Design a protein around this ligand. Structure first.
Ligand code: AZM
Ligand code: ZN
Length: 222
């Protein structure tokens, strides 16, 4: 079933597009969120074990995704190890800090060995060109499709050395809006060109951020 960010199948209507998408409207622990008030807590430190891999670059209609057909890129937090599957982008950002929307956001999507999902998010301010992303931007499929990149890509370069994060629980930001997703949002921001942002939008065909959702019961730790 088709869905999107504009027109008549937009995010406020995702719930009634089918029965399997119904948590997009009835869920109480949904992403993204406006992080406004937090609780200052002793969060467990992130350990990134990312290395170069032979990735491919896909345009799936809704985003530009970079898929990892093997394990090997992991991140460890609080004892559990999480395998990176794919990372991808929203322009503009989905999550907000104090009502601030950033020109782009990245989502590094993982499963531990229980299939318990974790999203690690990087936020992009407007700034100089992103040298480390230009490898992906060059081959970026400008319609639905897939290119195997034939030079190794290193996702370690897309994460900061300073790894403080905001921690909450949430959902996918795309249908079926499944819950049980751990959200870690990094505090140190990366940077993108105005042109890299336009180009993404040109490829994907729209602004691909879901509107922010109520926190309800949820507390955000920082
Ligand atoms: C099948 C699948 O993996 N779907 C998703 N992955 N990441 C998502 S996002 N916008 O929540 O981070 S939705
Ligand atoms: Zn996403």
């Amino acid at each position: 079933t088709h869905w999107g960010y504009t027109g008549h199948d937009s995010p406020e209507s995702w719930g009634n597009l089918s029965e399997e998408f119904r948590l997009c409207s009835t869920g109480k622990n949904q992403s993204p969120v406006n992080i406004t008030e937090t609780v200052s807590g002793k969060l467990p430190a992130i350990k990134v074990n990312y290395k170069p891999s032979m990735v491919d670059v896909e345009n799936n209609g809704h985003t530009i995704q970079v898929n990892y057909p093997e394990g090997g890129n992991t991140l460890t937090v609080n004892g559990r190890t999480y395998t990176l599957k794919q990372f991808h982008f929203h322009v503009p950002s989905e999550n907000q800090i104090k009502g601030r929307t950033f020109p782009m956001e990245a989502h590094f999507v993982h499963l531990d060995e229980n299939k318990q999902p974790l999203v690690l998010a990087v936020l992009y301010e407007a700034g100089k060109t992103n040298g480390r992303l230009s490898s992906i931007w060059n081959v970026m499929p400008m319609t639905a499709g897939k290119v195997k990149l034939n030079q190794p890509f290193d996702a370690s370069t897309l994460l900061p050395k300073r790894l403080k994060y905001y921690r909450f629980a949430g959902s996918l930001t795309t249908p079926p809006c499944t819950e049980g997703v751990s959200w870690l949002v990094l505090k140190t921001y990366d940077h993108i060109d105005q042109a890299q942002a336009e180009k993404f939008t040109r490829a994907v065909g729209s602004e691909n951020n879901r509107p922010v959702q109520p926190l309800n019961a949820r507390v955000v730790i920082e």
